[PDB]
Amino acid sequence: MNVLQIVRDHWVHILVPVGFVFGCYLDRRSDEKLTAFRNKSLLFKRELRPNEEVTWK
Amino acid sequence: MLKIIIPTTMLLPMTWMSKHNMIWINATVHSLLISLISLSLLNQLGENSLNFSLTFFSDSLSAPLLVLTTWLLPLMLMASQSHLSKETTTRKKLYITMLILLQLFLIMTFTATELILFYILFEATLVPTLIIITRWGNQTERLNAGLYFLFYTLAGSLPLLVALVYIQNTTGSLNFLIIHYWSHPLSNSWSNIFMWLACIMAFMVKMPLYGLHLWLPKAHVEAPIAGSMVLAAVLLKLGGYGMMRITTILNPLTNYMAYPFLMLSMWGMIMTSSICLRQTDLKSLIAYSSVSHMALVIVAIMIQTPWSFMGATALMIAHGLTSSMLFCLANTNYERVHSRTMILARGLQTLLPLMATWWLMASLTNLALPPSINLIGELFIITASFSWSNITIILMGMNMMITALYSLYMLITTQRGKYTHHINNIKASFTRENALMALHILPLLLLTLNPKMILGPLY
Amino acid sequence: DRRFLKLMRFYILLTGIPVAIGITLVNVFIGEAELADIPEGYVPEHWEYFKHPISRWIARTFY
Amino acid sequence: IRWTYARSANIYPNFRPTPKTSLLGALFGIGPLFFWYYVFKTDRDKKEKLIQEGKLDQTFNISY
Amino acid sequence: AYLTHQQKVLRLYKRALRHLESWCVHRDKYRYFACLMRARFDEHKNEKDMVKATQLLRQAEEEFWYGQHPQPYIFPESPGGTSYERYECYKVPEWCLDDWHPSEKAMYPDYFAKREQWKRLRRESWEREVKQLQEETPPGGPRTEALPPARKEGDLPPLWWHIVTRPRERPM
Amino acid sequence: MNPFASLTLTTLIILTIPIMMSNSNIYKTNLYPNYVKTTVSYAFTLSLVPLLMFMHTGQEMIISNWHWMTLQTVELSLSFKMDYFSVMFIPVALFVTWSIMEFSMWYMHSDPFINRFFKYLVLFLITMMILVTANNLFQLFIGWEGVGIMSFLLIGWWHGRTDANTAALQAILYNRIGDIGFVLSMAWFLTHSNAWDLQQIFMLNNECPNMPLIGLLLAAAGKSAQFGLHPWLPSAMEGPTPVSALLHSSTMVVAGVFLLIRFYPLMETNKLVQTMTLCLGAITTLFTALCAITQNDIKKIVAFSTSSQLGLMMVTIGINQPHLAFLHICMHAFFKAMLFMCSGSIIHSLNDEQDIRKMGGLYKAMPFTTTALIIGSLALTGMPYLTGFYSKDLIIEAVNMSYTNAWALLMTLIATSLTAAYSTRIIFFAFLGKPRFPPLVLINENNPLLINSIKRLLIGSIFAGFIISNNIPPMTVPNTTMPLYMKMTALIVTIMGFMLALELNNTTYYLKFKYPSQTYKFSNMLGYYPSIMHRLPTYHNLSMSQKSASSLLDLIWLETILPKTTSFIQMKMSIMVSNQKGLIKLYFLSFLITIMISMTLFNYHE
Amino acid sequence: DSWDKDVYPEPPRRTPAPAPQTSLPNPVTYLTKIFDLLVDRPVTLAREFIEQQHAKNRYYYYHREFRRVPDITECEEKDILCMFEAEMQWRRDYKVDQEIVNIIQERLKACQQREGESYRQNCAKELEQFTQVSKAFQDRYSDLGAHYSARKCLAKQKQRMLAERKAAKEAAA
Amino acid sequence: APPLTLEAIKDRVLYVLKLYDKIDPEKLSVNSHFMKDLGLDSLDQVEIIMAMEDEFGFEIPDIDAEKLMCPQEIVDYIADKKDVYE
Amino acid sequence: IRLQEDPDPEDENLYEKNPDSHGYDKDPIVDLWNMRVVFFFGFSIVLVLGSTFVAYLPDYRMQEWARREAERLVKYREANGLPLMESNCFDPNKIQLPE
Numbered sequence A: 001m002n003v004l005q006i007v008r009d010h011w012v013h014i015l016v017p018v019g020f021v022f023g024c025y026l027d028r029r030s031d032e033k034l035t036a037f038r039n040k041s042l043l044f045k046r047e048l049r050p051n052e053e054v055t056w057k
Numbered sequence B: 001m002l003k004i005i006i007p008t009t010m011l012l013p014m015t016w017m018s019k020h021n022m023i024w025i026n027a028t029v030h031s032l033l034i035s036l037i038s039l040s041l042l043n044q045l046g047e048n049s050l051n052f053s054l055t056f057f058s059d060s061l062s063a064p065l066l067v068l069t070t071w072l073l074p075l076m077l078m079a080s081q082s083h084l085s086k087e088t089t090t091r092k093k094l095y096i097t098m099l100i101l102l103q104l105f106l107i108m109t110f111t112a113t114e115l116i117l118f119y120i121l122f123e124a125t126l127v128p129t130l131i132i133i134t135r136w137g138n139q140t141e142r143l144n145a146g147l148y149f150l151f152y153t154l155a156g157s158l159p160l161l162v163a164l165v166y167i168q169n170t171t172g173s174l175n176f177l178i179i180h181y182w183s184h185p186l187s188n189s190w191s192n193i194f195m196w197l198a199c200i201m202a203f204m205v206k207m208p209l210y211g212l213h214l215w216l217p218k219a220h221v222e223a224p225i226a227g228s229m230v231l232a233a234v235l236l237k238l239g240g241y242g243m244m245r246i247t248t249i250l251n252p253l254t255n256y257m258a259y260p261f262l263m264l265s266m267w268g269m270i271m272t273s274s275i276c277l278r279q280t281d282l283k284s285l286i287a288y289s290s291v292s293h294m295a296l297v298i299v300a301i302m303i304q305t306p307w308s309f310m311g312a313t314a315l316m317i318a319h320g321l322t323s324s325m326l327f328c329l330a331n332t333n334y335e336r337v338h339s340r341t342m343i344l345a346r347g348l349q350t351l352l353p354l355m356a357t358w359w360l361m362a363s364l365t366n367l368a369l370p371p372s373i374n375l376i377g378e379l380f381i382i383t384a385s386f387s388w389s390n391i392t393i394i395l396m397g398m399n400m401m402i403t404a405l406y407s408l409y410m411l412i413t414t415q416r417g418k419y420t421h422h423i424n425n426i427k428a429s430f431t432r433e434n435a436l437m438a439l440h441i442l443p444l445l446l447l448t449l450n451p452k453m454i455l456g457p458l459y
Numbered sequence C: 001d002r003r004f005l006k007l008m009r010f011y012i013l014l015t016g017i018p019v020a021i022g023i024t025l026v027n028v029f030i031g032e033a034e035l036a037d038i039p040e041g042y043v044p045e046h047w048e049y050f051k052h053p054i055s056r057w058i059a060r061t062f063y
Numbered sequence D: 001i002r003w004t005y006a007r008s009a010n011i012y013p014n015f016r017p018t019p020k021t022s023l024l025g026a027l028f029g030i031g032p033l034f035f036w037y038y039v040f041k042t043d044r045d046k047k048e049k050l051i052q053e054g055k056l057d058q059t060f061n062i063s064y
Numbered sequence E: 001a002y003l004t005h006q007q008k009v010l011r012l013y014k015r016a017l018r019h020l021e022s023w024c025v026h027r028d029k030y031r032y033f034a035c036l037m038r039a040r041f042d043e044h045k046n047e048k049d050m051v052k053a054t055q056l057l058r059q060a061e062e063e064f065w066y067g068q069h070p071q072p073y074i075f076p077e078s079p080g081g082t083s084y085e086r087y088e089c090y091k092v093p094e095w096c097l098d099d100w101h102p103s104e105k106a107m108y109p110d111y112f113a114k115r116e117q118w119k120r121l122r123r124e125s126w127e128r129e130v131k132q133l134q135e136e137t138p139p140g141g142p143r144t145e146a147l148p149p150a151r152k153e154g155d156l157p158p159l160w161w162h163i164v165t166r167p168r169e170r171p172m
Numbered sequence F: 001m002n003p004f005a006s007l008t009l010t011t012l013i014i015l016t017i018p019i020m021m022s023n024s025n026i027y028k029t030n031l032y033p034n035y036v037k038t039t040v041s042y043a044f045t046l047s048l049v050p051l052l053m054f055m056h057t058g059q060e061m062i063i064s065n066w067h068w069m070t071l072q073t074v075e076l077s078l079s080f081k082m083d084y085f086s087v088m089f090i091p092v093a094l095f096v097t098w099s100i101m102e103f104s105m106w107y108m109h110s111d112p113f114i115n116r117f118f119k120y121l122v123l124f125l126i127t128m129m130i131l132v133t134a135n136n137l138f139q140l141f142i143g144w145e146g147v148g149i150m151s152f153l154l155i156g157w158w159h160g161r162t163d164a165n166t167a168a169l170q171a172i173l174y175n176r177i178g179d180i181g182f183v184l185s186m187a188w189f190l191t192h193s194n195a196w197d198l199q200q201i202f203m204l205n206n207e208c209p210n211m212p213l214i215g216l217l218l219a220a221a222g223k224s225a226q227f228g229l230h231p232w233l234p235s236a237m238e239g240p241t242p243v244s245a246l247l248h249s250s251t252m253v254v255a256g257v258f259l260l261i262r263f264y265p266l267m268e269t270n271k272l273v274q275t276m277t278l279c280l281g282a283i284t285t286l287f288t289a290l291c292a293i294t295q296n297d298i299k300k301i302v303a304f305s306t307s308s309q310l311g312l313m314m315v316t317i318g319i320n321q322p323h324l325a326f327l328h329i330c331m332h333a334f335f336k337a338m339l340f341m342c343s344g345s346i347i348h349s350l351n352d353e354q355d356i357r358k359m360g361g362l363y364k365a366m367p368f369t370t371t372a373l374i375i376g377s378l379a380l381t382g383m384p385y386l387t388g389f390y391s392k393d394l395i396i397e398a399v400n401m402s403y404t405n406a407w408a409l410l411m412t413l414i415a416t417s418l419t420a421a422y423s424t425r426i427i428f429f430a431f432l433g434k435p436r437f438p439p440l441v442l443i444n445e446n447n448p449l450l451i452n453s454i455k456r457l458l459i460g461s462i463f464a465g466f467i468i469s470n471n472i473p474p475m476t477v478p479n480t481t482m483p484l485y486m487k488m489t490a491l492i493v494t495i496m497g498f499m500l501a502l503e504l505n506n507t508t509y510y511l512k513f514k515y516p517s518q519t520y521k522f523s524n525m526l527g528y529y530p531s532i533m534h535r536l537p538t539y540h541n542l543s544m545s546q547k548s549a550s551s552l553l554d555l556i557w558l559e560t561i562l563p564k565t566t567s568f569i570q571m572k573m574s575i576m577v578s579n580q581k582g583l584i585k586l587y588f589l590s591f592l593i594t595i596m597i598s599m600t601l602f603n604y605h606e
Numbered sequence G: 001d002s003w004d005k006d007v008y009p010e011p012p013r014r015t016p017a018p019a020p021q022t023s024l025p026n027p028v029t030y031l032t033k034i035f036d037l038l039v040d041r042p043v044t045l046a047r048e049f050i051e052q053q054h055a056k057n058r059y060y061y062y063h064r065e066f067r068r069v070p071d072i073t074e075c076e077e078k079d080i081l082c083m084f085e086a087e088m089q090w091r092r093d094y095k096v097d098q099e100i101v102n103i104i105q106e107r108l109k110a111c112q113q114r115e116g117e118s119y120r121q122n123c124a125k126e127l128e129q130f131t132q133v134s135k136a137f138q139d140r141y142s143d144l145g146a147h148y149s150a151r152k153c154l155a156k157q158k159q160r161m162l163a164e165r166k167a168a169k170e171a172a173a
Numbered sequence H: 001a002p003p004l005t006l007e008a009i010k011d012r013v014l015y016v017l018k019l020y021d022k023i024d025p026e027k028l029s030v031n032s033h034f035m036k037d038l039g040l041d042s043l044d045q046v047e048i049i050m051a052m053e054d055e056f057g058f059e060i061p062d063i064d065a066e067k068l069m070c071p072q073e074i075v076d077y078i079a080d081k082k083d084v085y086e
Numbered sequence I: 001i002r003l004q005e006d007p008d009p010e011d012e013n014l015y016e017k018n019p020d021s022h023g024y025d026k027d028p029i030v031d032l033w034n035m036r037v038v039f040f041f042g043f044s045i046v047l048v049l050g051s052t053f054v055a056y057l058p059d060y061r062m063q064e065w066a067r068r069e070a071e072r073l074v075k076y077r078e079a080n081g082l083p084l085m086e087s088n089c090f091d092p093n094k095i096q097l098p099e
């Protein structure tokens, strides 16, 4: 009831979820900077799959 | 991490920009949500520590502690929203700011990849805690307690800073990875001995061995309930995490230099556990009990055995839930009686029967009964230390006996016996106090089913 | 004292039974996996290397 | 309240470094610590000798 | 206060025969030996030498403290008896009833109604109670802990509540 | 696929159902005691069948199940080993406690927290059944601590009574010192033999168990209440009569000797430790019995009779006869449970009075309770072809027919003669004779629950040994050829034990005075052990704790060594570096000193 | 069963033929027959439902096979690029070697209960098998330290042939 | 146990006082101080409440015992201690 | 008068106004809602749901995976008569022994 009023009272409940939504973004972005030797290690060396272009992302 | 950190710090504006009375509701709800995220991070790969970024990485030792801190965070808000209900909104909001700011520092401390980064927040926990003890603490000695608590660990931590930067000038980087992969035999020489002293004394002040433990009866007793939990549930284990980690470039020297602190700690546990039998304050009883169990962990590390570390991490976390819960136990009657003398509030089982139960498994867990993690922790160290030397069981075994004597003493004197007549301001236990204790006891028994998550990285 | 115990027992069951029936259901709907050698020219999925279907699903999600 | 203060707070302001407290402090202090140091090191040295010379038997001891 | 000559010997009589029971048992013996002790107690009943009376009390207790039974017999509801504080576990104080939930209070409406009559009586009687004590307390505080009666009319005795409203010895 | 696999665990899991229902609160808050009694009675019926294939098939199995945690080369997993000791001890334990549960709703027909009492009994019950059914030492430690803490609550059931807590504290205390040997045996087996499963410990041929077995002996001593670590059991009477009837008859204190029975195969290899068992066992028999016959309390005498039996029990182990020890365990259960059964019946009927000086004349007044007491007491002595003679007499015959440590052989003999002495003291000051209780007589025993409970145990304690001894596979070589005098001695020694005891008992009937005896002063005071070893060491340790440990070391010196010395050093000199007088003459003179000294001797010039 | 019989070799079970002498029936046999069609048959029926439902839609899983890589004996120093692969492989072989002792321990306990009181004589080959395993384990990882690493194994091992060659040259003299 | 009501109590009291051979049954009076009306010795008076103590199976404290002198107040004292209210 | 300070405030009873209070705040409606959130997000979401989560993580430390290689390794070694677990983990052929 009174969407504006409940927003005035309870709008703060979204900041932590979007922070978590923010949180996953860095871990799927900062990994790119740390790619470097992706698919270079001898133990996990696997041949390029026919539609796949890279390993873990 | 750049996954749990942001929700924790984004919780800071959330407490600040929220309704008048809804601060406790909102903070509690999302703090539990933060914990639920932390439960995921518990799983660890076999050998390689779970690495998230260059700045942050978590192994199978940080993760068991990391979830505990996140799970702790709702508990102080629950345990402290009673005596502070008669306070202004600004100071109320400021208190929530201090706690979550503290919990933020531990989150980035346990997961720090660089030892210097580890040190920066390892000490940085001092500032928010000192605020908590001094400002909202309800006593006169809290001022002396703050100075004792601050200067004890800071005076020990400064050599760590000088020691750590020296390693930087000698062995290049200092992150916890290359140190373990580029370990070198610390050559036995007088300079290296003082290097060993600097690299260890800082952490050993945090988990107070005998002698360097006078800040526990001061800080813990005078601190408020919310402060009382953290100073005994996470920051005591903060020395543990550093001790496990930093004992990687000190191991031709640990064997020779373990003896002075080992005898101090081994005698200390008999000494400290004996202090309990003639105590007067309930809060001091629990605080002194923390010294003895933690002093066991001092021995646990310095033997440097796969079993020794294995029971070390199990003991610390089981210690954290138990001692924090007992601190809630002291708080509940203290608010209702307005004194901390044990003999004042005798015979409380007859009045509050559930608080009789919640105290029963509280003292039972401190007894370290099997299969409670307290037992699986202490018993593990007993075996490893006994293999180290056979006479260890003479001391530590007797400690278990002495541990029982005072642990039932607090239960018997307060709960059992005839109720005190003149006291007539005892009311039925609030659903908050009972619910707060359930969230302390059920997790402890829940981990008992699977010790794999509590046994640490050497598992 | 009774109300608090009633609140825990009722509410902790509110999610207790649906998960309890859920754990049994997946154990009696799709079952547990079985050992199989690595097939020729096939990369196994990262989550495929686990026995319990819930465990496989947990590996499919966040981890 | 007087008892609790007397057993916790008044103790140090009333303390005086008499030789009675001084000797008793060392007797219950450094004394036991060094005594445990002697016995533990004596056995520890006794054990490591037999281990090094191959005298001690631990053929089934693996999980140390 | 203190214990005069008659009180000390009467206590000595009472405790010795109870000890004698634990020794003698077999009631036939009890009555016979009680008559012996009584007879040798009768012979000295005047002995106006009070010093000698105390002297006759010296070896009296010494004989007791040597010949006393190591396990004296006590009826169970006694200090040290087997049934001591057995039912103290259940004597919940009456003031705790004030914290009962209103729905719980509704289960016993008449008794709670009676609680109101006693409560309003203790509220009224309290003022008269303290007035009596202050207007009767001897100089230099109460010399004897004994409390006075309700000298006036229609008045409750001083400090009447806790003794009158004490929990029953058998609350179960 | 035999029922010996699943059922032997079913008779364990069903013990937990009454506990869970209490949490749900659907548990019958009106008839919970009957719910517990019927459940335990049922489990006894289930516990019957595994016995049958034990006699017929002779199979012994070990259950390994849900794996708790894998520790390097130590697979700590839940494990149940169904050995002859375990499978035989289950039905007797449940049958005894089912009878006890029958008694409880009679004795405790008025306790407001009766449902809580039955809750504790089941928790205690389930605790031992895993103590007696264990395969890994750690799970054996699970029940060992569980029974002790459960006994602590049960003894302190009347928590209002101050001495009840003190006795409760005493029980957990002596248990902890005894526990020290357990955890010592814990580490040694893990370090040397690298396991806790009983299979590996026996497999790895630990024939040099000198220290572990000493720890094992210390563990048994604390639990079974032997000399040195015992007076908790005689002082474990503040707990209600059913509590001592169940726990401290043959179902809590027995745990200690049963532990040695489990570790028998490696115990026999060493000779020093087993000899120490003869020492501890022999002295325990006497000092408990010596302090027993001079007790004016029926409950104290009965409890002392127990400790003597376990004192006799460990003697049986010392002669490398562990199976016969377990035989004594089962037989002692039937006697002593009824002994406490009888005492509970008379105590409650006679206005909860336990001082043995106040009974008498109940023989015609209480025929059934009298009959049971004659049954139990005669079984205790060893009446031939009764359940007592089937174990105790065989034990004594085996005791002398070995390389017994001289004084141990004599010590058991005098103790077994002393066994009848307190038994006569029971029957003499009780029913036999002229009554002495208060005038209002309310002697009632016609309650069906009390009658059925005793009768159920009564019928057992006549044919129990017959059934067990005939059906057990022979697991011990007997001795066949004895010289007649010492084969009969077990029978005779109790015959004088009856003969003089009645003489000295009816000597009190003589009208003449009874002089106080110094030997009686020593005996009636429980041998001075509690008056000395409970107030001398407690005072010294605790006075050291505050006067020096908590005061002199903590906040008289430790706060003075580092903190106050540093504060005072900063205190003293901060006065000296902050009390300048503001004279520029003094300031600039100091400047002259510094500029003079700096350019000079410290060689700053070069 | 599903688990391999060769890995856990259970010697053939010899079972006696019930040939009672007395006329009165065996209570064991009759009770087990009652136990048969009261619990076991409903259990068999219920399981057949589960197995037939499981087999209706079967999903597979494999076992990860980490390809072997150069260990720390060939990885040049200050090359944590190759040390990390070498260190991980050694720790991976550490857990596998722990399971080897776990398997041998289980066989040791299995024979001990299987032979009952005939344990000492029947299975003494198991003890000498386990003794050799533990002895080689002691020459291996045992006493590496809490912070064990592939480098420490090299040091502990290399120290051993240093003593061994020292012993060997002395024996040859 | 049946309630030890007041009339049952006082019936037990005067039954055992009339039992005393030195106290004649025909001169029993529930309200009569043991000396100035009956005539006795305080040495005998203490013996009386020892008989009372075994009669009711409990202990009368000596401090309260000495004050206890009248048969009616004997009934009164035992009534309050056993919380008898009728 | 020393100074003008209010005396010790009376320790209020949350039950005195509303007996149904849950000991969480003064206002009745938020008390019920505080009780809801502390429980709901305390046990069900974290304790109950998290326990099933933590009980059901994938292979921790490759535990059963580590066991699996043992079986084939066990079957390999004893069948061809080679000691089932070699004394030196690092093959001495690889390393060099100085002097």
Ligand SMILES: CCCCCCCCCCCCCCCCCC(=O)O[C@@H](COC(=O)CCCCCCCCCCCCCCC)COP(=O)(O)OC[C@H](O)CO
Pocket: B155, B156, B159, B162, B163, B164, B166, B167, B190, B191, B192, B194, B195, B197, B198, B201, B202
């Ligand atoms: C409150 C008192 C302190 C509490 C306890 C703290 C721990 C005790 C030891 C404190 C040591 C502080 C300095 C350590 C920093 C790191 C030192 C290190 O890594 O080792 C060096 C050890 O060298 C040292 O000399 C370190 C300091 C030794 C102790 C001397 C100063 C410390 C003691 C007094 C100051 C602290 C006490 C408080 C005074 C108010 C190695 O360098 P080196 O000497 O080998 O250099 C190369 C070459 O040989 C040329 O030097």
